[PDB]
């Protein structure tokens, strides 16, 4: 741990405080929260797509077509085996997978769809991104320290 | 003037070190530029972000990999999508993919140097840390661009 000493003027705590508690934060914790500048994890991304595939298979979505079924069902299965994961290759090819899993709901529904608790559509194209920028994350986070 | 103790890991601090006085900046006021601008609105960071990226388009950076020029690019297609929008979810999804513009760039930038300090026009090092200062973290991204437009 490491000590940081922010000398800035006392209008200014005053008001970094108020919106760090008008947020529900610690002081501390809200002015990292500002500096840094990390994307969401893959661990995090892979929680949120399973939470919403799970929505879709409780959904007309999941016998829409076979591409939605296999890419619901994928997604989740991914991202559990991510989840139970105690080593970096299993995540690895995990995170592949459940991308695999969202290029086959994706590919089954209209292009820019809208969906119903898109649910689907935009929703989860903004989470797993690209294919060049989920490969570097996917290493970053998972293919070494 | 005001005290404010921070205590984050010796790495983080480090880290927020290393960058500040690559810039020529004091440590605090490099913290406080970035905290104060989260304030701002998503068209501007957008339009400022867009003409960062036209910046570096002109520059080196843009030929050193494809995740730079892809980055580079969809920052400003996006932005420009975001400005010619007429609804909101669709504002949405531009901001959105604005900022993982700016995660490709990051991640085909350097991340080391020759020479005292890195050439800024063959590394983009200081223009990507003010599109980091302007668009922040995802999640925080994404929290401000619903607050907006959601």
Not at 91 to 100: C, G, M, P, S, Y
Request: with cysteine; aromatic share 8%; charged share 25%.
């Amino acid at each position: 741990d490491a000590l940081i000493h922010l000398r800035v003027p006392a209008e200014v705590k005053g008001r970094w405080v108020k919106e760090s508690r008008l947020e529900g934060m610690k002081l501390t914790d809200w002015i990292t929260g500002r500096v840094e500048a990390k994307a969401l994890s893959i661990a995090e991304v892979l929680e949120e797509a399973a939470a919403m595939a799970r929505s879709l298979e409780d959904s007309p979505i999941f016998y829409r077509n076979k591409l939605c079924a296999d890419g619901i069902v994928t997604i989740q299965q991914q991202a559990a085996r991510f989840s139970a994961a105690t080593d970096d290759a299993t995540r690895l090819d995990a995170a592949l997978w459940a991308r695999e899993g969202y290029q086959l709901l994706s590919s089954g529904l209209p292009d820019s769809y809208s969906g119903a608790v898109w649910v689907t559509a935009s929703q989860m194209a903004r989470l797993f991104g690209g294919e060049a920028l989920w490969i570097e994350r996917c290493q970053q986070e998972l293919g070494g320290a």
